[PDB]
Design a binder for this molecule. Structure first.
Ligand code: NAG
Ligand code: K
Lengths: 214, 215
């Protein structure tokens, strides 16, 4: 039995009411309809059982309702610890099935990235590789563009980017950008610059490392 | 306290099989059904089947009734799942979870990360990230060249609120790159020792890397 969750992704500011829905392709008994919450890197947690009963420890701002094919989870007042993915579950028939999820994010104030650049360690240089790392920490919203410049020319190859999900405390994103070259290629250039474009500044937020200053 | 403890992460070759375990403690093992579920990165949950340790009966998703075999050992209060003839698309986190009232899933194992791949298990190289030659200073560790997932990173530092970020790993050419940043008051470092501690359970290795200032 297919369960379709909507919206797939949504954001709410603190204190706002949030409702998410799960629609089944067939009727399912309300006694065998459940909700789970999952945070990145962790197991799912039973959140609501039999449509409207809160699991042990679940804050009272949550509720659930529904019958037939349409079910909903409502959060009366969005709070920071509520940012997570929520899944519906039917066990009306075997096999039991789960929704594709509603990822609920926290809206917050714009924050500029704090940029930090790091040269290759002497330890990595013995391996025949060289990585330059740029952290772009504690920014909002998630939308950001990172460019690497080597002695003024853009470098696009050998760049690995990764983003955290919203920080538990301040709800910002962070991003890591790693430029990896061969040691030979690394030693043919002087300066390595990571440049961040973000809505909080009309100018890029940049940091550079020069080989001659170190 | 009810606990479901799953076996560690493993790498398995295409065409081989895997067997993973889920050790139950703190309740009557034989009184509750255990379910097994699959979760691919960035997807929802898919149910594989259940084991009833009371009568040794297992029920399967028709999709999985060929591939999966669920068993349990009453002697050790342990449920097991065998997955046979594996391919790349069997790579996922697998959970065991306890069937409760109205077949809600109340207690969950921590997950077992299964990677199916032709590549070799390789331990990480860990490199210190120290500033080149402010009241706050950001340092980090670069965790390169390992396979498979996961690794864990823990810091010994004076990090501030929202001051630790460990980035999800990125795969490239059968090897993962992960990084982690820590932001500490500039009075604490290089004064006090800051260390990133990396574990890679699939290769049974760890690394304790001190962040030394560049000379
Ligand atoms: C279930 O319903 C959704 C939404 O109407 C539809 O797109 C999908 O095709 C349906 N699936 C099946 C297997 O009938
Ligand atoms: K050490």
């Amino acid at each position: 039995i297919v369960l379709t969750q909507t919206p797939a992704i949504m954001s709410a500011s603190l204190g706002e009411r949030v409702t998410m829905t799960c629609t089944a392709n067939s009727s399912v008994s309300s006694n065998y309809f459940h909700w789970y919450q999952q945070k990145p890197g962790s197991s799912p947690k039973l959140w609501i059982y039999s449509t409207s009963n809160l699991a042990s420890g679940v804050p009272t701002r949550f509720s659930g309702s529904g019958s037939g094919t349409s079910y909903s989870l409502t959060l009366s007042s969005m709070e920071a610890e509520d940012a997570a993915t929520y899944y519906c579950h039917q066990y009306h028939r075997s096999p039991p099935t789960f929704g594709s999820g509603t990822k609920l994010k926290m809206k917050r104030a714009d924050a500029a990235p704090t940029v930090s650049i790091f040269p290759p360690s002497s330890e990595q240089l013995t391996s025949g590789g060289a990585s330059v790392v740029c952290f772009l920490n504690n920014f909002y919203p998630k939308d950001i563009n990172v460019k690497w410049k080597i002695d003024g020319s853009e470098r696009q190859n050998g760049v690995l980017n990764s983003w955290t999900d919203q920080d538990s405390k301040d709800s910002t994103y962070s991003m890591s950008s790693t430029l990896t070259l061969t040691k030979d290629e690394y030693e043919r250039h002087n300066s390595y610059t990571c440049e961040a474009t973000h809505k909080t500044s009309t100018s890029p937020i940049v940091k550079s490392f020069n080989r001659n200053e170190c | 306290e009810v606990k479901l403890e799953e076996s560690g992460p493993e790498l398995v070759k295409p065409g081989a099989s895997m067997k993973m375990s889920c050790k139950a403690s703190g309740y009557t093992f034989t009184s509750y059904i255990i379910h097994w579920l699959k979760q691919k990165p960035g997807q929802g949950l898919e149910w594989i089947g259940y084991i009833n340790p009371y009568n040794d009966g297992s029920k399967y998703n028709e999709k999985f009734k060929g591939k999966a075999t669920l068993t349990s050992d009453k002697s050790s209060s342990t449920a097991y799942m065998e997955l046979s003839s594996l391919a790349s698309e069997d790579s996922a986190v697998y959970y065991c979870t306890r069937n409760y009232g109205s077949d809600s899933l109340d207690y969950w194992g921590q997950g077992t990360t299964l990677t199916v791949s032709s590549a070799k298990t390789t331990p990480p190289s860990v490199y210190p990230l120290a500033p080149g030659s402010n009241s706050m200073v950001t340092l980090g560790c670069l965790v390169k060249g390992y396979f498979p997932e996961p690794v864990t990173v823990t810091w010994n530092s004076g990090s501030l609120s929202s001051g630790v970020h460990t980035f999800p790993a990125v795969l490239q050419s059968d090897l993962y790159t992960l990084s982690s940043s820590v932001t500490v008051p500039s009075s604490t470092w290089p004064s006090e020792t800051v260390t990133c501690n990396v574990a890679h359970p699939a290769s049974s290795t760890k690394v304790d890397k001190k962040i030394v200032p560049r000379d």
